[PDB]
Amino acid sequence: PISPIETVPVKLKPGMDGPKVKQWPLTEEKIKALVEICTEMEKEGKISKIGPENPYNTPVFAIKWRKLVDFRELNKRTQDFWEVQLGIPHPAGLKKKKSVTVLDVGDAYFSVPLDEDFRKYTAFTIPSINNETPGIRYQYNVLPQGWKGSPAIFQSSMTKILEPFKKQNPDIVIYQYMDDLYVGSDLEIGQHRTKIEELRQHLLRWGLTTPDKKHQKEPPFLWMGYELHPDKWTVQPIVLPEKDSWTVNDIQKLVGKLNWASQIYPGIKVRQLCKLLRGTKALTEVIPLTEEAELELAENREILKEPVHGVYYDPSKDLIAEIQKQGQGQWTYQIYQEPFKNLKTGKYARMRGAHTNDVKQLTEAVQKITTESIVIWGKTPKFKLPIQKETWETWWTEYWQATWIPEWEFVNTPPLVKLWYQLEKEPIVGAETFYVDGAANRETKLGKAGYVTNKGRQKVVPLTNTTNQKTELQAIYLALQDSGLEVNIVTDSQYALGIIQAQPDKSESELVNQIIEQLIKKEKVYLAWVPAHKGIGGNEQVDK
Amino acid sequence: IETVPVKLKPGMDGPKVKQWPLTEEKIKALVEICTEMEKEGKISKIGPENPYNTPVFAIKKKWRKLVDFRELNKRTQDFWEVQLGIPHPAGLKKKKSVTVLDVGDAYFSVPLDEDFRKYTAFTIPSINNETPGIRYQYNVLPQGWKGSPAIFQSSMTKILEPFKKQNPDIVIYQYMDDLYVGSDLEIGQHRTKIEELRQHLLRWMGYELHPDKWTVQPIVLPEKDSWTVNDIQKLVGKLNWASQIYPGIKVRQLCKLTKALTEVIPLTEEAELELAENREILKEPVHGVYYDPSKDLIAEIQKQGQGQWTYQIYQEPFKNLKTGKYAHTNDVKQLTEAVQKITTESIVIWGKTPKFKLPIQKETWETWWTEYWQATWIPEWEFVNTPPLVKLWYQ
Numbered sequence: 001p002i003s004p005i006e007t008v009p010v011k012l013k014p015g016m017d018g019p020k021v022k023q024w025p026l027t028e029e030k031i032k033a034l035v036e037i038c039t040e041m042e043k044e045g046k047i048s049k050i051g052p053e054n055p056y057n058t059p060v061f062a063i064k065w066r067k068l069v070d071f072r073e074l075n076k077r078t079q080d081f082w083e084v085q086l087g088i089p090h091p092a093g094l095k096k097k098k099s100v101t102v103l104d105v106g107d108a109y110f111s112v113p114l115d116e117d118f119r120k121y122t123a124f125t126i127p128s129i130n131n132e133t134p135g136i137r138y139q140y141n142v143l144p145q146g147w148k149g150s151p152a153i154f155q156s157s158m159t160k161i162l163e164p165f166k167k168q169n170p171d172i173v174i175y176q177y178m179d180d181l182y183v184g185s186d187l188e189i190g191q192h193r194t195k196i197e198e199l200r201q202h203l204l205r206w207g208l209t210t211p212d213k214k215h216q217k218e219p220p221f222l223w224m225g226y227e228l229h230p231d232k233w234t235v236q237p238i239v240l241p242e243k244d245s246w247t248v249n250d251i252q253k254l255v256g257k258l259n260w261a262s263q264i265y266p267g268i269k270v271r272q273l274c275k276l277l278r279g280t281k282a283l284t285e286v287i288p289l290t291e292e293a294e295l296e297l298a299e300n301r302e303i304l305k306e307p308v309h310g311v312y313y314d315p316s317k318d319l320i321a322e323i324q325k326q327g328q329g330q331w332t333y334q335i336y337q338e339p340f341k342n343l344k345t346g347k348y349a350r351m352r353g354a355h356t357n358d359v360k361q362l363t364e365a366v367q368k369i370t371t372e373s374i375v376i377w378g379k380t381p382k383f384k385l386p387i388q389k390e391t392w393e394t395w396w397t398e399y400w401q402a403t404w405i406p407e408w409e410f411v412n413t414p415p416l417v418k419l420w421y422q423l424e425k426e427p428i429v430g431a432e433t434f435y436v437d438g439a440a441n442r443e444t445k446l447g448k449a450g451y452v453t454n455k456g457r458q459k460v461v462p463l464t465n466t467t468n469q470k471t472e473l474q475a476i477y478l479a480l481q482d483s484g485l486e487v488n489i490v491t492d493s494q495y496a497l498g499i500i501q502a503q504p505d506k507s508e509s510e511l512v513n514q515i516i517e518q519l520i521k522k523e524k525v526y527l528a529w530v531p532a533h534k535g536i537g538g539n540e541q542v543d544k
Numbered sequence: 545i546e547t548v549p550v551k552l553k554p555g556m557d558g559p560k561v562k563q564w565p566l567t568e569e570k571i572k573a574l575v576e577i578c579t580e581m582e583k584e585g586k587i588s589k590i591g592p593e594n595p596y597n598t599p600v601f602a603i604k605k606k607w608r609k610l611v612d613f614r615e616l617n618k619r620t621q622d623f624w625e626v627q628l629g630i631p632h633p634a635g636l637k638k639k640k641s642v643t644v645l646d647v648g649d650a651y652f653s654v655p656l657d658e659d660f661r662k663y664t665a666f667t668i669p670s671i672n673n674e675t676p677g678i679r680y681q682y683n684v685l686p687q688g689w690k691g692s693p694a695i696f697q698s699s700m701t702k703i704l705e706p707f708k709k710q711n712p713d714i715v716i717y718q719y720m721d722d723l724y725v726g727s728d729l730e731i732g733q734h735r736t737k738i739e740e741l742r743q744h745l746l747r748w749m750g751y752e753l754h755p756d757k758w759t760v761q762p763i764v765l766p767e768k769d770s771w772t773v774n775d776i777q778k779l780v781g782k783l784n785w786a787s788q789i790y791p792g793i794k795v796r797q798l799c800k801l802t803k804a805l806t807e808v809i810p811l812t813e814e815a816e817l818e819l820a821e822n823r824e825i826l827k828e829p830v831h832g833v834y835y836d837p838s839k840d841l842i843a844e845i846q847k848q849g850q851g852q853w854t855y856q857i858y859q860e861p862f863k864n865l866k867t868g869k870y871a872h873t874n875d876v877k878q879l880t881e882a883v884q885k886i887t888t889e890s891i892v893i894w895g896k897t898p899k900f901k902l903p904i905q906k907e908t909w910e911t912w913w914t915e916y917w918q919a920t921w922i923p924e925w926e927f928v929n930t931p932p933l934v935k936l937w938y939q
């Protein structure tokens with residue numbers, strides 16, 4: 001049918017006019033297909049024979065028999081609409097329903113009225129057996145298939161018309177996705193089916209027809225890669241058949257499928273499989289599966305052995321989020337309300353920063369979970385972290401950046417997060433003082449990294465092909481080597497001070513990683529800063 | 545009735561900013577708000593033919609709707625600033641007492657240029673995107689739009705005309721939604737003039753500010769009385785940085801005083817002559833720094849630990865127009881308050897808000913900033929990696 005819903009005022013962009021592109025004559029048959037089709041549509045009221053001469057026109061053609069109008073031109077000249085793509089519910093955010101049904105709308109776009117003042121713009125011509133006679137002119141009376149306002153105006157229409165029934169049945173839940181309606185409820189089958197015919201009948205009063213008893217309804221639903229039961233949810237079934245050869249293409253898809261599953265499958269690992277992709281990779285090259293990964297694939301297969309489903313959300317219960325340190329850079333977490341009955345699973349493994357330490361990462365994870373929990377449940381979870389509340393406040397307090405975790409509490413699931421060393425806050429007494437510095441020719445791309453002492457010593461390992469910065473972490477490094485378990489170092493490089501002064505415990509820099517391990521063996525280290533080329537006792541001597 | 549033609553800067557297009565996810569509790573409070581507002585004709589539902597959006601939040605101060613017109617404002621500046629800009633009196637900052645009155649709730653009288661309403665569109669989201677999301681537009685002067693006071697000046701001036709005349713020594717300044725009214729009257733007297741003013745407003749105390757009593761945050765040097773290499777090293781360290789501000793600082797004599805770090809050493813009689821004068825400077829105002837009304841204001845904040853926070857305001861890196869400090873509290877809660885305080889003072893002083901550089905993670909700030917916010921404006925902000933020594937040189 002055609003809904004009587006009032007239309008949406010459509011307009012062309014600021015100073016642009018209707019489109020006017022000419023028709024690439026078609027073939028005998030395609031012409032015949034177009035005529036049959038239009039005639040029917042024409043009978044349905046979906047279109048109208050346009051008289052005089054609408055100077056406007058958009059190409060039309062047939063594909064095998066169906067008709068496709070080319071709408072680019074009209075599109076580009078058409079206004080912008082409120083985005084229909086803002087987000088899609090996560091299943092773990094859904095409340096539990098007793099009965100679910102899915103009615104699909106037939107001929108949606110075609111069942112919704114286009115704005116009459118705009119109809120004139122959608123004019124097209126079915127050619128004559130070869131550019132001889134004018135041709136049958138047609139404009140649209142309803143949302144055309146390829147048009148840009150159709151998805152928007154439709155979604156707005158379906159809502160306005162769905163509003164009254166919702167209001168007379170607030171206890172009921174209805175979700176619109178494209179050409180479908182998911183209806184859920186806590187009514188018992190018998191009474192639920194009544195409630196649906198009541199909907200279909202309300203929906204027919206508004207021009208929208210639905211499946212009689214064909215209701216695709218009746219769970220295991222497939223929506224956006226999910227499988228949906230009224231009581232539980234899980235990700236769509238995924239297989240990983242045997243293979244002795246893996247192409248970039250293959251392991252691409254595998255990584256993707258793994259990542260998607262890790263949404264409800266606890267302990268999904270893809271770190272080792274991600275490496276194999278490192279480097280400029282042709283999609284068809286076979287990549288030998290390394291050892292660290294060899295096992296990872298089957299241990300993945302293992303946890304995917306028996307299916308797993310997540311539960312739904314109970315608005316009258318706190319959320320519990322707990323996180324697990326898993327390998328280096330990798331983090332994992334679960335979210336539940338009743339111990340170990342998960343709502344959703346997830347992991348976090350990134351960097352974005354050059355230098356970092358577990359305590360920072362843990363906080364980032366909590367942060368990501370915090371905003372994920374907001375968008376989904378509209379409230380914040382209670383945390384359980386593998387960090388002593390003390391070891392958190394220390395860092396919390398001393399650090400120069402602000403932070404604020406929601407309510408949390410300690411949980412002893414090793415490995416535990418901790419600082420791997422603590423720089424002295426005051427100069428060490430009776431321990432070698434090391435005035436260190438670096439240099440480098442910006443042209444020769446080489447430099448000298450050295451140091452001098454309050455005890456006469458002196459060095460200078462020459463370095464080849466290093467920037468002006470390395471020869472500063474190199475120096476500090478050199479000093480942490482020739483010194484005893486207890487020391488204090490003087491730099492003129494704030495670059496190095498900042499790095500080391502934030503208690504890194506891991507970095508994407510082989511030099512920094514060395515300085516790290518070294519810092520962990522000492523029993524006292526003090527790093528002070530003094531201005532460069534300011535001839536300060538000690539620094540100057542090493543500058544020479 | 546009579547609408548003031550509002551035109552978006554020639555060329556520029558409406559704002560199209562996405563709505564931030566909100567908590568269930570705030571969402572609920574927004575609908576109840578937005579239900580009353582349309583019931584009394586202040587806002588209207590809109591359709592998909594409107595591709596515009598501005599974010600909304602809920603604050604307490606009893607919930608209150610708060611729209612973030614940061615973007616709309618940046619795209620209409622010509623209107624509110626060079627078209628109908630309000631002049632800022634230098635006297636305000638000099639008065640003993642300044643009271644901040646919330647007068648926003650009066651823009652709802654004047655209607656907005658129909659042709660301009662579609663740019664004021666906002667969205668009330670829904671938990672987990674289970675429902676489309678309720679769309680609105682204003683059909684009257686919105687509270688957070690710099691255009692409102694601009695348009696609302698004729699009414700404002702008429703309202704004040706009498707009060708001013710009877711009180712020609714009272715400075716009244718308007719900046720978005722707020723009136724700043726200061727005087728040199730004694731405590732109680734001032735408060736009586738405010739109440740006597742509130743009544744004028746009616747026919748169409750609260751926030752005690754004391755600007756006149758604001759002074760520089762002097763960079764201080766340790767007093768000590770023994771001094772060590774490390775000590776003197778740090779001592780010159782900040783004296784170096786200070787060199788880049790406060791023309792005259794001389795670290796030469798100090799810097800002329802290999803050697804262990806923990807080795808105590810007695811300064812030179814000539815030494816005191818240095819940090820003495822250097823001390824006399826730093827306490828005195830900077831020489832050569834002037835506010836430039838055409839340049840935007842920057843503000844850096846550093847975390848001093850112990851609920852302490854230092855801050856500087858400048859238009860050019862290192863040349864400071866002003867520096868100061870600020871004392872269930874958390875990092876983000878204290879920082880939010882700091883940002884609010886610094887901004888009030890900026891407005892009182894220059895009639896504009898500074899652009900903030902925040903020592904925090906973008907997501908962390910974005911997640912929580914709303915929780916403790918109370919002002920009805922929102923300054924521009926950026927996120928930075930607090931330089932280790934910069935924090936120390938302002939301790």
Ligand SMILES: O=C1c2ccccc2C(=O)N1CCOC(=S)Nc1ccc(I)cc1
Nearest residue numbers: 089094095100173175182184228229230674
């Ligand atoms: O019915 C849906 C539905 C189906 C698929 C995807 C998203 C969706 C939705 O938001 N809604 C509305 C809310 O549904 C709620 S609260 N609970 C449900 C709905 C459907 C099912 I199967 C299980 C649980």
